Write a protein that binds this ligand. Structure first.
Ligand SMILES: O=c1ccn([C@@H]2O[C@H](COP(=O)(O)O)[C@@H](O)[C@H]2O)c(=O)[nH]1
Ligand SMILES: O=c1ccn([C@@H]2O[C@H](COP(=O)(O)O)[C@@H](O)[C@H]2O)c(=O)[nH]1
Lengths: 314, 311
């Protein structure tokens, strides 16, 4: 229907802006495999009872077999992702998945990535692919096809330092007359992100302000928000004094904020600075704090309740 | 094994700085399949006669089949890349392959990319993966493993706008005590690349300059060049005023320059601005002008001879 409408519907459904990050590393997979075998696959057996696992399109036969040795890594990697989604999805307004974690093993991880997006799409849960794509317009069309046609993602992240015009070939497809949403990197959770995003300037404005400004110019040029799509901003949770300014200077803009949890922020200051009455425009991404926690559903609910309490106090 | 030594060794062997870009699109694959079907698989049959094709590690049971299905697209895509490598590798100092062209179909294209790097690695031809990676240090280690451990690439491209420190987790691996090379995006061939790389500045030095300096400071901090690795710059062929500034201000730097051919540059002016006696420090990337040309070897030789004349 459009990412804007889809986000706004689900926010009424579950009343949160929590964005769960699903970034499984190699140690998450082996710990999951060892724990399932020592506990008689209690989580995997629960996955196979879930409805939508019968609708994934890649190696469905292998995935539904009860515990083909070369497929062992594919099996537990994919089932670990189902486990996290099954355990925590009721608290998630959005799921964000970083492309880097699904490529380091070659094609096998892309098949897992495809199944994860198929799974979330049948749950009708909004998705974000954190791929931070950037290239010339001819080349970036390949990224658009992978993100929005193959995976059927709702959105992705973009690094427009090479030029804002790349958004014309990411957020718009003239041949299908289709519109897509994206989050451009504005201020990032790197400790040394300032050297370029702060200390560079044009007309006594810091680079992140000018980059956010240029991003919205492209958004209006492509008429995304008339098609219920948008171009948003990635603003790190630790950047409290740029967050305010983004919300103040650009009201009604969508912000994706990572850095709470594994990178050690303060949730109240982040959410209040980026707050908006439509709080789907202030997505709080929490990944490793949930996915590496021993009781993931318990962890998701903890951050779910904390976010709602800070919303009420707004 | 070091990238600096590998580049300079091969440069003496074939005496060129041509970088052949292998960016096959959807129509390159369909056209290759169509012509192979019309002409009794003459190029695919030539690919299977090569000794080194046995060195690919993914689905060799399909790749080495006589030409004959769900595996049909994978087969012709993979063989098209081998076809180009077989036709043109004698003129290439390095091969650069842009990750974007290998992902849009899902995992199948990554299998081709792996086999392509396997093929080039056994031919001992230097490789570049044009992926322009950028992320936090924890995340980018995954790119380093995919690029330098899985594909065994010699180098890749990086966008350090998120912070120079990501190079610490790309060009160096503390657990293995291994060093890798990279090319940082400095000035790009976008028509509107100026909006950020030119008009942004610190104390009236343009953003690309401060990014280039910050890139080499990181290279010196990691002691890359004593481990026969380096950090280089991506400087567009059309940017003659910055190409010359980089060559003078950073005299011994490695430069990777794309944009000649399909993006309508002038080879003489680009190469002269960035020239260095060790001309492996000025790689000229040519992609579509060769891969989309009807006679790829003839086009590669055309640019090879043209580059050699400019010296
Ligand atoms: O400025 C940014 C942009 C994106 N991410 C991504 O967000 C996720 C953070 O998850 P975690 O730190 O909660 O585990 C990772 O995928 C990371 O690459 C950041 O951490 N900071
Ligand atoms: O500033 C840049 C940086 C990288 N590339 C890459 O170089 C190749 C262009 O070669 P060609 O096919 O245009 O000849 C593509 O992979 C493209 O993504 C550019 O064209 N311009």
């Amino acid at each position: 229907m459009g990412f804007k409408v889809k986000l706004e519907k689900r926010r009424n459904a579950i009343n949160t802006c929590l964005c769960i990050g699903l970034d499984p590393d190699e140690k998450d997979i082996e710990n999951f495999m060892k724990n399932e075998k020592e506990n008689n696959y209690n989580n995997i057996k629960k996955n196979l009872k879930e409805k939508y696992i019968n609708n994934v399109s890649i190696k469905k036969d292998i995935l539904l077999k009860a515990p083909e040795k070369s497929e062992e890594f594919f099996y537990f990697f994919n089932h670990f992702c189902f486990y996290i989604i099954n355990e925590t999805n009721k608290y998630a307004l959005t799921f964000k998945m970083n492309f880097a974690f699904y490529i380091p093993y070659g094609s096998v991880g892309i098949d897992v990535l495809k199944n994860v997006f198929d799974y979330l799409y049948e749950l009708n849960i909004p998705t974000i692919l954190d791929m931070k794509i950037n290239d010339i317009g001819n080349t970036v069309k390949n990224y658009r096809k992978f993100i929005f046609e193959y995976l059927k993602s709702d959105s992705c992240t973009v690094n427009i330092y090479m030029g804002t015009n790349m958004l014309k070939d990411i957020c718009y497809d003239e041949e299908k007359n289709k519109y897509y949403s994206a989050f451009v990197l504005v201020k990032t959770t790197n400790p040394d992100s300032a050297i370029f995003q702060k200390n560079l300037s044009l007309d006594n404005k810091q680079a992140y302000v000018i980059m956010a400004q240029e991003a919205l110019n492209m958004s209006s040029y492509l008429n995304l928000e008339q098609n219920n799509e948008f171009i948003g901003f990635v603003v790190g949770a630790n950047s409290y004094d740029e967050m305010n300014y983004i919300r103040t200077y650009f009201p009604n803009c969508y912000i994706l904020s990572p850095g709470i949890g594994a990178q050690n922020g303060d949730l109240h200051k982040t959410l209040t600075n980026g707050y908006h009455k439509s709080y789907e425009k202030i997505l709080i991404n929490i990944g490793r704090a949930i996915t590496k926690n021993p009781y993931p559903q318990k962890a998701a609910q903890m951050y779910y309740d904390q976010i709602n309490a800070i919303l009420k106090q707004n």
